[PDB]
Every structure is written in structure tokens, then in C-alpha cells.
Amino acid sequence: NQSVVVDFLLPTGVYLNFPVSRNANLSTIKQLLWHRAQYEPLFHMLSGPEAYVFTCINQTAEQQELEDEQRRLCDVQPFLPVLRLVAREGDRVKKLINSQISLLIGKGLHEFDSLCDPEVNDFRAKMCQFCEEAAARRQQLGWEAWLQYSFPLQLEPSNRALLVNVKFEGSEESFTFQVSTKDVPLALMACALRPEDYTLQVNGRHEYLYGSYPLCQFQYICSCLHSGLTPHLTMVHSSSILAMRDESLWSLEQPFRIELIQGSKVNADERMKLVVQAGLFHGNEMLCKTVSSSEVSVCSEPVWKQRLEFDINICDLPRMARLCFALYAVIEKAADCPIAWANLMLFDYKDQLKTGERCLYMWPSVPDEKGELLNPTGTVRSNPNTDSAAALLICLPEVAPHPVYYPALEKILELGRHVTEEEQLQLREILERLYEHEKDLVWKLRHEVQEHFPEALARLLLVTKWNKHEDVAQMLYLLCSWPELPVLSALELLDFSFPDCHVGSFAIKSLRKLTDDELFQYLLQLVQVLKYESYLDCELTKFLLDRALANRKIGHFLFWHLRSEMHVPSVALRFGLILEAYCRGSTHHMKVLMKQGEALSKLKALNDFVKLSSQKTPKPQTKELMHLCMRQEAYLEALSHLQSPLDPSTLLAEVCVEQCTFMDSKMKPLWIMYSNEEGGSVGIIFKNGDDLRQDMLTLQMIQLMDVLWKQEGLDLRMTPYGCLPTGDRTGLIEVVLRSDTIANIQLDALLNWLKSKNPGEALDRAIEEFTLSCAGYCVATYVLGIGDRHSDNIMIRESGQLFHIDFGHFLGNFERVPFILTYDFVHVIQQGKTNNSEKFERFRGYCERAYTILRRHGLLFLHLFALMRAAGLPELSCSKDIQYLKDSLALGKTEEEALKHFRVKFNEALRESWKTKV
Amino acid sequence: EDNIEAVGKKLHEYNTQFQEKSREYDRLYEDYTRTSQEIQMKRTAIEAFNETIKIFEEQCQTQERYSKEYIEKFKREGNETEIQRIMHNYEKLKSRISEIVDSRRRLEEDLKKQAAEYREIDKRMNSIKPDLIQLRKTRDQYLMWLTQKGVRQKKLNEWLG
Ligand SMILES: C[C@@H](c1cnn(Cc2ccccc2)c(=O)c1C1CCCC1)n1nc(-c2cncc(O)c2)c2c(N)ncnc21
């Protein structure tokens, strides 16, 4: 029904209870309250209604003061329908922001206090203050700054005449005139007056045109030229932009030891017996051999109480040393079940060697292809289901009567400091392109590696003996004068094999030269690498927050990559703290994100209804029921007039309800059409229950391929549309309009569809668009190992651009995937002819140049995929997955040899093309 | 130890058994994940009950402090009527707390039954893993034995499912 009975608690102690409409806003409900309270005792002592604010307990279990009384009760979503009147006072701004953060990140702030963890409390105090300071600096910088922060330039990776329609803010009349295709935007403005206090807005979008670049370097312009469309712009005065802004350790030769006390809440087969295995690691290398418990009988609460002694001294343990346990069940010595596992840093976040008891809430082991003893790669965070998870109770003993700290940098360089030609040729050999024998040589000639082969830092770091504080001190000495490496090399160094914080820091130092455009190509991988960190305050976090704070589009996508994993226990805490801090630095964007979260939350409920209905009854009706649900006051408002999450410069204005529908697959994805006051029409797919991460990654790589291509004058007319995970098996996909699937178009049929969409002298354009894009997607899918490619998941735009959708599967998985040519596409490429070798040769050319460009950036793909392994996609688990790409790009081969093998596979694919069709 | 077609057939059997136990494991791990997410939701809900109840108890404390004056200021002025109204209003606040408390307890009972479900799942996951692991390995050894025998990839592909 409509109404709900709400408890009201008045500040006199008086309690009333009555029905209110679920839809009524708090302001209305406050009137109804006053009107009923005059007939209850002690009315006369109340101040007026405006002197008080309602408080509730919200879904995240925090008390929230409801400052915005235009909000409907059903949106407030109180835990129980209990509203309390309290005074206004006492920094309402902190209170409001604090309450909004909790709702936005899905996680109550109080859950961080609850941990009683100084590492957490330190993170929030430093980072929130940094983020707030940046925000305050930004307000005090002028309007240009604000524009750059908020709407950074959208530029093509990079003289005919050009006519453009310009207008001024708040005026029907408009000014069409030809202009300099290569004259800086200022000159468009200076002209339109017939200057420096304006920018140009792209009509009906938050894209702005400014800066020292020329007009056809802008996406909008560049798309207009190609389409033939007349740009449509609005001049906007400075003020109207201000109006948006404004509204010791090395003396401990005793060996490392632990006390294994007890386990709790173990759930194992009572016939079997239980063993704990423990090892020491630095990254993925063992520091010494492993040591094991005795068998004890299986029980819920098993008890060992044994010393486990390792073969390394306390003085040798490196900073990032990591103690790793695994609880195993064995069939009593007369398939071992790996139960669960847990890792523990031995030094704390402030550098102190840990002492005392620890309770490790363990994670369950998953039987995987490697089947390693232990899981040294896993997180050092304890399982947060502390109430029901299995745990180990252990005791780090005392070592000295004072605390001990890993030594300070000064003392590391104190210790750290202090020619053959046959040796200078063996090394060059090894690095022009490890095993026991070569590791000793490289360690010996480490000074040469620094002088002559700076790019081989990664190799030298792996040869170094992280179980020997002398070696470690020496390696770090060189590391500190190591010259700066290119972005590419830095990306390698952010992998799990390089756990040392000096390394991480040297890497980030090399990533600081990234432009915002380039960083954005890698943003997702950089996020995943956070899973490899040990401590909460790290340089990569600080770098990501820096760049989020300087550029709003980066902060937007950082927020969604972090928010989309807040349901994953092993990262909820880390991502949650980053999100808090990001929010406190971006209060404007917060308002955009808040709007997006409520649109999305409504799509979830709207989607859960449509799955549930679809079981009950058939589609035409469920369709109409979806529509009624949508037009409800509160659905409609929440779904209308937001910025798109796929692209925050796109406005989703009015939902076109009669065009809204859904797909027929098992989770019933929603197709939601919009219209804004600009194109003119935008669509999104809302998915809930499908996983979108495989699609996202693939689409991100296709995009990166397009950039690298375009950066060499090769524009292959690709369609790398948005995909954005936003939650637990939830996210959005950009609808490509004026496009249709091959299967639909087929049931010279492809060639006729094109003819009808491009009559007469625009057919040659269509065909050439198809040719370029057919090459790009042919090469893309081949390089990435994408099979399962059929007429349902290949589409075509009315322009003629062909493109692939709904990716699924890559790197060979459910078997190398041959290069593939389809006869029906060869036909169109050949213009409806049997033999058109002029055309067909050009196409092969495009194919070959594209493959050739990607080989030159092959290590870039390999590094990027290496970091994505952190994501735990089933399809990108292991080293062989990375091996698929090395082979697909023939990186073990000369370029000439690479192109020759490509050519062969190209021709075989041409032969194969006829045999499938028959 | 055997002949090739006999080894190949048993490879198909062991592979089939591997895919099936693998699917069953996946079923459980999914219940594990979901049940974990639900338990945490209930735990946070229990916290919300607690914060709500806390709020009611401040209201009670407020009522006893604040009312005092107004009960003795109404006694002199003959308004045992106004006093009665305050106290019945108060009595109504109290009965509502008992309801909220009763709901808190229903939840904790549900969280209890579900904590136990979580442990039975983890126990069942743990009784399966040995077979899972053993099946993967046995399968892999049969593949190995066949590869060394020089059996072509086409044959190994038929047998694998
Ligand atoms: C398949 C086609 C499609 C899907 N659904 N309906 C609605 C419908 C479904 C069933 C009944 C009625 C309406 C569609 O009308 C379509 C197209 C058919 C011709 C016009 C649009 N599609 N699929 C994606 C996409 C999906 N999942 C993951 C991705 O990565 C991409 C997609 C897209 N991004 N852009 C355009 N069309 C896209």
C-alpha cells in the first residue's frame, strides 16, 4: 500500500505514531507532525518546525540527519520508520558530508572506527586532510583552473573550410559562419562577437572548447567533419562558469620463530587430521624452507601449542617479509585437502617488527590449477567475517626489551655503499635476451647493469637475495641512484613480484609523467594492483588520489572502479577508505555520483521485478508493467536528469518510457532510452546478474588499440563503446545507435542494407568504413584470442562501420584462434565483385599495418595483462594466458618473420573463407 | 600398463567426473559467497536495531529528566489530567521498545541458523576438495601417458568430454 506507520520522537520525550505516505517528502511529513503534535502533551515548549531536523537510522546502520527535506521518505530508506527531532547545531557541513559518504560508498564510516585499528585511523586522517586541502586550493584558483579540473579537453589522438553554428547563453537566435579548421578556438570566439572571458560549450553536453589547440583536434569537431554535420556551440561567460563552481634490527642473529597456538571454527572431515604449513616470502619468492605442525585430530577448535622455527635470522628478514600459513587436512599417515590460508606481514605499517598474539581470520582455499602449498600472493588483510570464519591464533615472541624497527633509509645506505670484458659480453648476451648461473653474474655485475642497462632493473631486483640484509642493502643503494625509466618499464615494476616499497616508489615516480589521457588508458590496471599492496597508506594510492583530485573525469572512473568492488571482502576496507577520501576532495562530483547511484538503485529494483515477472507471464505485458513501475513519481525523478555514468559529460535527460524495454536473456537486461535537449537520443543497457568485467577489459583493449593506431595516422573507424561495472554483477553498457546485428540484417543482403542506408554517392563511404573497421576488428580479435564470434555478436552501423559486441571469452578460451575472414565481408570489401584485387589488397594492407603497430607496443599489452591477473578473471589467471599474447603477436620473432607468418595465416584464412560458406 | 583406446576411454570417464565435481564445487562456492554476503547484511541490520533501540533509550532518559518539572508544576495546579497524558504517552514509548526488541531477537535467531549453514557449506566444500584435486590429477596423468605414447591432439580432444 501507499502509507506507512512512522514513530516520531519529540525532544520533550513525547512519542507519536501515525501513517504517512511513503512518497511524501520530509517537509510535508514535518507539517503533518506539527499538526498532530499540537494535540499531544507539551506542545507549547517546542520551537518552530524549522528549528529542528529529523534524524533516522539508515540502511548502513548510522544515524543521519536529514538536512534535505525535499527528499521522499522512500528514498531516505530508514532502517525502521523512526524519525527523531533534534536541534540543528554543530557543523552541519561535516555531518552532512559524512552521512553522504556512507551511503555513496555503500559502507558506513562507523565500520572503520569499529575496527579500532591505528593503521586505518592514520590513513583517514592523513588522506582526508590531503584531499580536503586540495579541494580548498581548487576553490581559490580562478575559473580556467575550474574548467580544466572539471571538463578536461577531449582531444583526438593528435585545411578544408568549416561552417559552425554559434549562439550565446539564453538567446534563441544563432550565428552560422565558415571558419578556420586550423585556428585556435579563441579566434572562433573573437569572431563570434562581431573574447578571453569566454569558452565554448558543445550544445547539450558538458564538453568545452578552449586552450592552445586547433579546432579539428577536438573529438566533437572531428566527428562533425567526418559525419558532415554542422557544429552547434554556445558561448558562455566566465561568471556563468564561476556560477557552477560556486553552486638495532641488524644485531639480532637469533632465528625467526613463531608459536602456533590454536585454531577455531574449523569445518573439516572428522576422520582426517589437521596440519598447518607456514612459510616466509618476499613477493612470490620463499625466504627460507617451509616448516609444518604435527598432525592433530580434526576438531572445530584444534590445539597445537608448538614452536615453529625457520631457517633465517631476524636480522635478515626484509621489510616486506610476509608469513604465510595454510591449514590442511591430511588422511592420517599410515589428495590433501587445503582448508584455508592466511598471510601476515612481520613488520607493521610504521616499520616496527611485530610482537605478541595475533588472531588470523583465514580465507578458504579454492582448488586451482597450480595447487601450491601456500598462497603468498594473497592479501594480508584478515577475513572480515570475524564472527564465522576459521582462525589461527599465533604468537610472535619478544626479541629485545625495546621495540625494533626495520632500519631507516640512512642506515640502509650506510651499509649499502661498496671489470672483465668476457663478463661484459655474457651479461649483454643475457639482457639482449633466469637461471641459477646467470643470477650470480648479474649480481656480481650489478653496477654495470645500472650504468649500461637501466631498463633491466626488474631482472636485477629478482636476482637479489631478499633473505640477506647485506644484499638487500646493496640493491637498494643502486636503486636510489637508478635513473628514471619509461612508463612502460614502470608498469612492469608495479607487479606482485616487486613487493619492496622503494621499488613501488621508484615506479610511481616514473608514472608521474603520464598525461591524463594516457593514465586513463591504464586506470583499471592500476586499480587492480592495489590488491597486491600490504599497507593502506601507499604511494600508488596517493598517486591515484592526486590525479583524481586534479582531473574530475579520472576521479569519476576511479570512483566507479573502486565502488564496483565494495562487495568483495578482501578489498571493501581498502577501497572504502580510498573512496571516503576521494569524496572529501570532490564534493561537487559527489552530487553527480549521488544522482547516479539512485538512478542505478532504481534500475536494480526495476530489473529484479522484470526477471520475477517474466517467469510469471509473457513479454508484451511485462513490458507494459515495467513502464507503469517507471512512471511512478519516485522512479521517474531518480531515472531522469542525471549525468551518464559511462561519460559524465553526456546528459541523460528525459527517459523515453515507451522506448524502454529489455533483452530476453536469463538476467533480463534493460534497454533504457533517453532524450536530452542537445544525435538527440542516448541509450544504456543496465545489467544485473551478468558479469561485465570481461566485456569491460576487452573493450578497454580495443580502445587502446584504436589510440595506438590513430597515433600513427591509421584510423580504423573502431567503435569502442562504454562498459562500466558499478556493483555486484551490475553495470552499464553504452548503446550504439543506428546499428543492427548481422543476423537481423541477413534474416547481397549485407550489401543491400548498406545501399539502402547510403543511397547513391555515399555508398563508397560506407564500404570504405566497413573495410577499415573490418581490418581493425579482424586483427583485434586475432591478437586477443577472441572466438565465439558470430552474426548475433557482430553489428554494423549505418555509416558502414562494423563492430563487435558482448565479448565473453579471450586468449583462446572455450586451441589457438586462427585469424578469421568471412566471405560475406570480403564480398562487401570487394564491392559486390568476385575479384577486386585493388580493393582487397588495400584491406590486406590495413590488416598488416594494424598488426604491425600492435607488435611495436607488445610489451605494453603484456604488462597491462600481467597487472590484470590481480582481477581474478577466470580467463586471465596464469602465465600461459600472457603466453597466448606473446605468441599471437609473435614477439619472439623478427618483425619481418612476424609479418611473413601473419601473411600465411592471412592467406589460409582467405582459403578457409570459401569452405565455411559452402 | 594398458592399451591406448582403453586408456583414452578412462580419460573420458575421469574427465567427465572431473567436470561434474568441478561444477558441484562451483555450486557450493556460490552458496558460500551469497551466504557470506547475507550474514554480513544481517550483522549490519543487527547493528541498526541496536542503534534504533539506543535512540529509544535516550528518548526515555529525556522523558524522565524533562517531564519531572511538568508533573510537579501540574500537581499544584490540579492538572492530574495533563500528568496522566504525559505518563500514558510515556507508557506508549515503552511498549514500542519491546516490539523493536522482539524484532531484534528474531533477526539474531535467523543469523544464528545461517551462521551454522555457512559452516556446513564450508564443511561440504572441504569434503569435496580431495576428490576434486584427485580427479584433476588422475586426468592429467592419463593425458600425459597418452601424449608420451604419441596420441595426436584430435583423439585427445574427442575424449576430453
Ligand atoms: C544485440 C544488440 C541489441 C540488444 N538488445 N536490444 C533490445 C531488444 C532485445 C530484444 C527485444 C527487443 C529489444 C536491441 O534492440 C539490440 C539491437 C537490435 C537492433 C537494434 C538494437 N546489442 N547488444 C549490445 C550489447 C549487449 N551486451 C553487451 C555488450 O557489450 C553489448 C548492444 C550495444 N551496446 N549497442 C547496440 N546494440 C546492442
CA of A602 to the centre of ligand 1 (A): 21
Pocket of ligand 1 (CB under 6 A): A 661, 663-664, 671, 685, 695, 721, 723, 733-736, 739-741, 744, 805-806
Residues present in chain A in total: 918
User: Would you call A60 an interface residue with chain B, using a CB distance cutoff of 8 Å?
Assistant: yes
Out of A9, A42, A269, the one facing B86 most closely (by C-beta) is: A42
CB contact under 8 A, B66 and A388: no
Using alpha carbons, select from A158, A149, A169, A159 the residue that is nearest to residue A219: A158
CB atoms under 10 Å from CB of B124, counted, come to: 17
Cα(A552)–Cα(A550) distance, rounded to whole angstroms? 7
Using alpha carbons, select from A384, A577, A707 the residue that is nearest to residue B36: A384
Cα(A725)–Cα(A733) distance, rounded to whole angstroms? 9
Resolution (A): 2.3
Task: State the DSSP string of A798-841.
Answer: TTS-EEE------TT----------HHHHHHHTTT-S--HHHHH
Structural contact between residues A844 and A778, judged by C-beta atoms closer than 8 angstroms: no
| Architecture of the CATH domain A255-396 | Sandwich (2.60)
CA distances for A135 relative to A35, A373, A554, A871, angstroms: 43, 48, 15, 31
For A681, the enclosing helix (H) or strand (E) is strand A681-688
Reported as half-sphere exposure (CB side, CA atoms, 13 A), residue A507 has a value of 26
Would you state the cell numbers that stand for residue A410, as one nine-digit string?
A: 640512512
3-class DSSP state of A434: coil
Residue A192 sits at the vertex; the CA angle it makes with A189 and A195, to the nearest 5 degrees, is 40
Window B:87-126, CB contacts with A under 8 Å: 89-90, 92-93, 96, 100, 115, 118-120, 122-123, 125-126
Named by the residue before each, gaps in chain B exceeding 2.5 A from C to N are none
3-class DSSP state of A17: strand
Cα(B28)–Cα(A633) distance, rounded to whole angstroms? 41
**What fold does the segment set A409-592 form as a domain?**
1.25.40
Nearest chain A CA: its distance from B5 CA (Å): 23
Structural contact between residues A825 and A803, judged by C-beta atoms closer than 8 angstroms: no
Mutate to test the pocket of ligand 1, among A694, A702, A735 (most ligand atoms within 8 A of CB): A735
Using alpha carbons, select from A215, A219, A217, A220 the residue that is nearest to residue A232: A220
For A201, the enclosing helix (H) or strand (E) is strand A198-202
Q: Which residues contact A755 (CB under 8 A, 6 or more apart)?
A: A763
Q: Whose CA is nearest to atom 11 of ligand 1?
A: A663
Task: State the DSSP string of A250-307.
Answer: GG--SEEEEEEEEEES----SSSEEEEEEEEEETTEESS--EEPPPEE--SS-EEEEE
Q: Which residues contact A513 (CB under 8 A, 6 or more apart)?
A: A487
Q: Which residues contact A619 (CB under 8 A, 6 or more apart)?
A: A664
Would you state the cell numbers that stand for residue A793, as one nine-digit string?
A: 555478436
Alpha-carbon Rg for chain B in angstroms: 33
Residue A274 sits at the vertex; the CA angle it makes with A270 and A278, to the nearest 5 degrees, is 160
CA of A794 to the centre of ligand 1 (A): 11
Q: Is the dihedral of CA B152, B156, B158, B159 positive or negative?
A: positive
Domains, chain B, ranges and CATH?
19-139 (1.10.287.1490)
**What are all long-range contacts of B80-86, with beta carbons under 8 Å and residues at least 24 apart?**
B82/A41, B85/A40, B85/A41, B86/A14, B86/A41, B86/A42
Structural contact between residues A863 and A491, judged by C-beta atoms closer than 8 angstroms: yes
Structural contact between residues B50 and B101, judged by C-beta atoms closer than 8 angstroms: no
CB contact under 8 A, B93 and A15: yes
Task: State the DSSP string of A87-151.
Answer: E--S-HHHHHHHHHHHHHHTS-THHHHTT--HHHHHHHHHHHHHHHHHHHHHHHS-HHHHHHHHS
Interface test with B, best of A5, A10, A14, A16 (most B CBs within 10 A): A14
Interface test with A, best of B59, B111, B138, B160 (most A CBs within 10 A): B59
Q: Which residues contact A228 (CB under 8 A, 6 or more apart)?
A: none
Q: Whose CA is nearest to atom 5 of ligand 1?
A: A663
Nearest chain A CA: its distance from B161 CA (Å): 13
Structural biology method used = X-ray
